[model samples]
Target: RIGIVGAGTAGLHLGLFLRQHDVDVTVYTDRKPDEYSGLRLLNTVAHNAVTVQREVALDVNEWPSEEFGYFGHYYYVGGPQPMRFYGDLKAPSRAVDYRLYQPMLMRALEARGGKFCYDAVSAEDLEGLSEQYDLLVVCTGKYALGKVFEKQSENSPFEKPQRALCVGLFKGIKEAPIRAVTMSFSPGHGELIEIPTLSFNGMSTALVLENHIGSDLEVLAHTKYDDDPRAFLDLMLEKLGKHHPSVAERIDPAEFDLANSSLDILQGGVVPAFRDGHATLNNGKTIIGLGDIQATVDPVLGQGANMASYAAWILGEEILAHSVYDLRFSEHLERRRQDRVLCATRWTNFTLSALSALPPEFLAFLQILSQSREMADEFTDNFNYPERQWDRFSSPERIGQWCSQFA
Candidate 1:
């Protein structure tokens, strides 16, 4: 029997995969089915093509792309000479509200006879769990339990979160003209990424403000919105008007409000970091970390959940082939995902680099991406394939080579 803690994307996906083989699996989570729906929004994540395929493979994906998916990204880069363009995606990516997505999967896992332990787990519970299950996996976020795996200082570049984030599901934001994510990059201020999503209240748009520290765009994140209710909506409008005018063009201020103040909002930034792939508990049991626990990245790139899903599939394959779940097993898992996961972290870390510090080659690379439809499509689609994206973005030499093609 395998014991999985934290039924988030990585845990639930892995649990369901294991259960498909009739493997005895017990998934432990803190929230019940109804509580999941009642609670605050978990995140504004778009599962890229690869993750969507993984869910389809596991037979847990009932949401169709035509109705619930987004086709690509609309890029708006701000500067003295501002630029805007629509990048086409070869495959569709879908962002479904986690409140709705997770519970559906939870019930599916239960239907498959996988167990669910509705209990909050702390670090102290590891010893007791180690003794009961043949193999244990830690798949939570950066909670106390996830901290058991020591942070990999080398890969974790940001000592703290680089962006001040404020995300909400709101009504009155018009749908994208092309049905794609609209990303507005105001070099010094921050970014406003608008994703159209299917949530509890039919369909709504999730607006994320990835603000630079101390910038004007960071205001809403620190404001005491509960004390002054209308400030958030009005302030976001000012942000939209100045920083993201195209998005502002579609706003109807009268109807623009959070779907539900209690459940449709989340705020905070994630430190772009990766922890040690594996850890050994005090009781001599070897365990591994998954999803946001093992490696957490900024949402600027939208790679967090997709990478977690990829890691989960890699882990599922390893668990089935191995007899001993020990340090070696954990090491193999690291080798399988390290390059791809590290590439994602490196890419996001670099993207968050100060605008003034951006290299000429990187700028030139972006120039070509904007000018050439083919290049832009590849760049947008490769969000599903990070290692490939990194191949082009990795070095000045690679960027120069690609840029010269258009020169």
Candidate 2:
């Protein structure tokens, strides 16, 4: 039996996938899915093809049709004339609802007799938990009880957050022409992503603001949610109208509030870090780390859940392949996980830093992408496959080569 901690995207999905393999898995979480309805919205609305493939393979893609594909990307680099270009993805993407989907997933897992322990674990509990299961995987990410693994300072980047995040789940905002996510950048100011979501009100928009820390756009962090929640909505509208009038014009001010005040808006920052996956408890037993707890990257690129799903799949494969739960198996699993997550972490770091001055090569590539629909489609579709990004998106020399050929 495998013991997993936390029932978030990583844990729940791991349980579902493991059960299919006839692996006896036990999941531990503090809150039930029903309790999440009153909590604030946690994640935004988007998943690439890589993540979609995992969902489909697990047979948990319940809301497949609700996904909306972007015909082209709407890019605003602090200009009146925004650049529009289409992307080529193997399959369209979808935004997930934690409240609606998690409970449904738990039900599915339970139906297969997957064990779920509705309780919290403390730092002292790991020793006992490790003894009960053949292997204990911590899937709680940053929310786990005790500090099981130390930050792998060498692989981790960004000591502090590079941006302040503001997310508003809203209604009455009109969809864009292409029905895709709109990302606007204001150089040193911040980034604004307009997302189409399957919200409580049904088919709503999510205004996610990634403000550079200490910039004027960081007002969302200063606003107190308890005093007046409308201030949050108003702040989003105010910023939208000033920076992106195209998106602002579609809003119906009277109906701009969130679906549920308690669960409508979410604000937070992520410190990019990689943890030593193996931890030796006081009892001389070692447990492995999984998901956010193992490696956390800033969500500016919207790759958190995607990485989580990828990590789960990789870890599951390793578990099935390795019969012995020893130091070598732990080291082997860590190597595979790092190999998969490294590109995502690097891409996220580079993009976050490039917000101020996007690489000339990339800007030039974007110009070429605008002219050729085929180029734009290929570039856009590759968002689903981060592994293919090295030569095109992350390499200046390769991107220059691409620009010349397409030019």
Candidate 3:
């Protein structure tokens, strides 16, 4: 038996995958069925081995036609570049559906044979589950989950800056903006991403703001719900309407239908790693961490889910290869983990720091890369590989490689 905690997308996906392999998987979650509505699907990216096509095929068997998407668009908000753009070369991909994807994914598991227990989890509950199950998997989003990795970094230059994320789904969006994704860099504000639809699909927009919140009173004290996502969207859209009329016109909270919206206020946090597996509770039971619990990159780039799926697959394989509750298996599991989660933590932390740096840092890097199409291509390649992300950004060979208006 494999006991996984928190049946969010990560846990659910993990459970579904493991169950298919004849592993008795049980998912423990406290969220209500209705609460799943608030769990808006962040646009899914089709990259790496965990592509949506394969994922839905393996998990969403009956609903194969649902998964869709496109490549992406990278734009310069107020720059002289064309208003609409695509990633590097001009091309397009498909779209996705968020709401439909998870339930469909979850339903497959329930129908094919999987167990789900809707309840809050704690160290005590985990202990028993850990003992009964051959292994335990902890899958939670980046933050709010307990810290599992220890301090593996020091003198880290990573700094947290305030930013607001305004997100919503809209109708009347006949097609994606020629590309699967559209990312723009505004002058003073932050980035804006418009991801084309994917499984559980719809048209969605995300506007990121720089230090948009003034104080706790303005950002938190004014909060209504635990985290009032709608309030933040209104605040950002209003600000955008005042400064950038053209951009503001595209966002319509009213006509836009505001399927969902929120502000992602920034805060300072640490990124660490675990060299060995450990038990989370008494009775000598254990819970190994994966996904955001193991490492978290800034949402600025939208890599969290991709990283989570990768980690889950790695652990899923490890559990399947070993016997149920094999005490000696933890070491091999650690060795396997070194290949994925460990490296993921280090790279994510470094990439996050670079992103958190002054705009000058990123601007210099981007400007340098843009000069040569090859360099720009390499730059995208560097980002896809986080372990080498900093090497590309901080390399002296690349630095001062080009001239720019800002420089």
Candidate 4:
């Protein structure tokens, strides 16, 4: 028996795959079924699971959007001049309506003939179930299960959640060339990724502000940061004006239409933390961490969901390949977890480190990639999958491509 905690995308999807492979799985969650009330999945980039999710359950496919926009612009703000690193490069995507996806996932589990218990879980919860299950997997986000991770290696850039982001969906935001655009602020202070999304009825623009500065702006607005969503937005506008003049000139928070429900400000802080893939609990029993509990990539790059998907695949593979009921089950699962997560951890670390560094040449390279057709296409490939090539970012090919822009 496989015991899984949390019913978000990771846990639910893993359960689907595991059950398909004939493994008996049980899932637990504390959320009341209707709790996801008004929220739409803001990160369209995370929608890559749409196809697989649909295959797992017909209900999951109900939320699919025919038109999924590109991952907006990648620009620089603090540099000598504003330039687009990668323009609106159209990449295949889908808009995920959480309303549909969440319920669909639940039905998928039900269809599998698996079991689900809606309850708050504790370490004790795992112990009681261990008698009936071979292994346990935790999929709760930072809020619930983040502390379970033993912060091992901290230098991995991918795991560092050093910035606070304010994201919202705006009605009637215009687009040029493509449905998405990214504005990269200079000196690595922040980035704005705007993508067109499907809202309750009409079209809406998803605005994401990733920055290290505005987190304090909220506190400065009031005696203490009350997590007032609007406070974060006001601070964001101020930060944008100070740091990104181009976008600053375009933003008008007052005019921002949030689809009658008042614009939903998606705000959260990210941190870099990693557990050594496999972990032993206080009882000397071992379990594997999933999603943000295991590792997190900065949200700016839009790779957090992608990284989690990869981790889920790894966990799924381990569970299927080994009996998981054997004495060696824990050890084998740990080894597989380490192998898969370490690769993503290394890749995110290197990419984030390079992106955070505000180098002149790097800025110029970004400009060429965004505005120039030939350069932008190459950049799109790099942007979507940085690890595809061993040195795609650092390669002489990329460097040469940028160097030609200067000449």
Candidate 5:
């Protein structure tokens, strides 16, 4: 049997996909179904066309049809009256309430006779797990037992966070545009994204702040939502007032708190790193890392979960291709994972740190997007296919070839 650690997007989906193929697998998670509740609001687990297809393929997505839909990509770039741009996505996208979504996925997995151990794992647990299973995969991210994988510093770019991230879900955010994902970028200050999403309490607005470290926007980190809920809301309003008055005007202080105490508003940043894709246990047995455990990028690009889903599918394919779970198989999986995730990672890294002046090629592309609705739509739709992003954003020649159409 294959041993899986973690029940997050990567783990649960991996388990479901593997079992669908009649592969035996057991999943381990730190929290039980009940424990997933009462946390502060987590990140918006948004699903574009690609990710939604993965869920549909598993036959476990029970979310209501009306609960999820497409939204235009609204951009607000710098100045007193920031230049505004809106582009419609070709396919619909949905943001899930992970607290509810996760539990339901677990139930679906169990319904299929998938075995799950609701116990937290430690580094010490590896020995016995390795003995029990032919191949063990870790997917819980850096916060869990996956931290045992040594950081591949040579593969990592930034030594620290390029931006401090603050994310929250609030009620009574009235009069905001529906069917839109609004992003306000203030160059050196940071970027703010307002999304219409499903929260713990039902439909609500999600505000994610990406403050450049040490910038004025960074104050949101100091105002901890878990410690002082009211202050968190107040700070959001204060920052919005200065940077994005349209969002600020919609806030209702009376209804600003997250749905419950357990629901979390996020703070802090993740230093982007690529860990050794495969690690060796004390006994010389090898294991693989998935999702954020293997590679973490800033969520500014909204590719974190999508990348995880993609990696999960890639892993499934790799497993099916190999007859034996050996060092060679592990190496093959790692190489394939890198190929799939590289473009997405490079795109995210550039967006997170390239604050001052964007590359001239991309600038020209954006200029074309501003003037041509067709170009804008194409750009917006490509978020669903992150691997395609590198070609658009990287080469001046490729960018020019595309932009020339508008001329």
Candidate 6:
């Protein structure tokens, strides 16, 4: 039997994966599937192609991708010399509302006889959970549980949030001909990721304001959305026009409003962090971290959930193969985790630094990406193969060495 806390994408994936093999799996959640919509901002998480495949493998994706999925990424960098390109995904990716998507997975897990516990598990409860189940995997950050895992870091220099976000499910933007997610990079301001999502109201675009903290754009996150709706929206319109003109051109001011009720918005800051693979509870039982508790990447590239699902799948494989959930097994999982997990984190951290610093080769690659659609598609698919992206973008020396051969 396995006990995993948090009914998030990662936990659900693990729970359902184990259930298929007749393993007794129990998933504990703070909230039920029915009330998840009331959350302030559930998340506009875009599950990549690989993640989509994992969901399909579990047969939990009730929402059809043909109807709800998107095709490519429309990248834009605003400046004196703007750079814009559309990178196509090999397979369509869906950005379904977490409020709905997570619940659907929960429902499927229960259907397969996976235990669903609806309780607020505290730090004190972890010891009992570890004792009860053959293995306990944590997937939440709500309590002090995460602190149990040792703090791990990299040299990105961002202990605090570099980007503040004001994300909302809204109805206003005109559908692009291609129907792609637009990542607009407005230098000196921040990034705006306009994502098409399957919300409560069928389909609506989620405008993710990745506002750089300390910049003028950060004020958008603080502006109250419900208190003065008109003023809040008007300011957003003004900012979009000035900073993110590409996304601005698609706005239909008259039809723009919240997609659902008052709860369809999320505002927060992003701080990237990772933890060591495992921690021991007071009972001398070892537990492992999963999902955001494992490593939280900046959502600039929309890879956190993808990263989460990827790790959860690996965790499932480890569980099915091993007899004892001991330190040795945990060590093997960490070895597998290092390249895929750490690479995505570093790529995201470096991509965040795109506003200021760039090695000569990295800059040249961007110029190459803009001119060639094939190269653009290759880079876009890198979201699926995060380690490969790091291999190419990891060091200036690697890129410089390759470029010199061509030059």
- Each candidate's number of clashing pairs is 0, 5, 20, 18, 9, 0
Query: Against the unseen true structure, what C-alpha lDDT does each candidate score?
Result: 0.84, 0.75, 0.51, 0.58, 0.76, 0.83
**lDDT over C-alpha atoms for residue 203 of model 2:** 76
Residues 1-407 of candidate 3 have per-residue lDDT tens digits of 88887765567777877887888888777764445545644434334324344475465544332243444345444434424323442222333444455556666777778887877776445666766777777776333445443433442234443354334444333344444455555444344445554322344533333223342113322333335556755665565555443456656466543334332122232233332244445565556776656554445555566666666766778777867444466667666654444444455454444444545656666555445555554444343455455444445453444333223
TM-score of each: 0.96, 0.91, 0.72, 0.77, 0.91, 0.96
Question: Model 5 RMSD to the real structure?
Answer: 2.4
**Residue 138 of candidate 3: its Cα lDDT?**
76
RMSD of each: 1.5, 2.4, 5.7, 4.7, 2.4, 1.8
Off by over 4 Å in 4: 38-45, 49-59, 71-80, 85-91, 97-100, 142-144, 154-161, 186-188, 214-255, 260-263, 282-284, 325-357, 367-372, 393-407
Q: Output the worst ten-in-a-row residue range by lDDT, candidate 5.
A: 63-72
Clashing pairs in 5: 38-262, 39-262, 39-263, 39-264, 40-262, 40-263, 40-264, 41-263, 41-264
Model 1, C-alpha of 373: deviation from truth (Å): 1.0
lDDT, candidate 1, 282-400, per-residue tens: 87889888888888888888888888789989998899989899988888888898899889988888778834266777777777878887777778888888888778777878778
How many backbone clashes can be found in candidate 5? 9
Q: Which candidate is the best by TM-score?
A: 1
The stretch of ten residues in a row with the least summed lDDT in candidate 6 is 398-407
lDDT of 6 at 256: 79
Candidate with better lDDT, 1 vs 2: 1
Off by over 4 Å in 6: 155-157, 358-361, 401-407
- RMSD of candidate 1 to the truth, in angstroms, is 1.5
Candidate 2 RMSD computed on C-alpha atoms after optimal superposition onto the true structure? 2.4
Cα error, candidate 1, residue 223 (Å): 1.7
Better of 1 and 4 by lDDT: 1
lDDT of 4 by residue, 205-265 (tens): 6666655544433332232224454664566567656766665565667764554354244
Error of 3 at 302 (Å): 0.8
Error of 3 at 309 (Å): 0.5
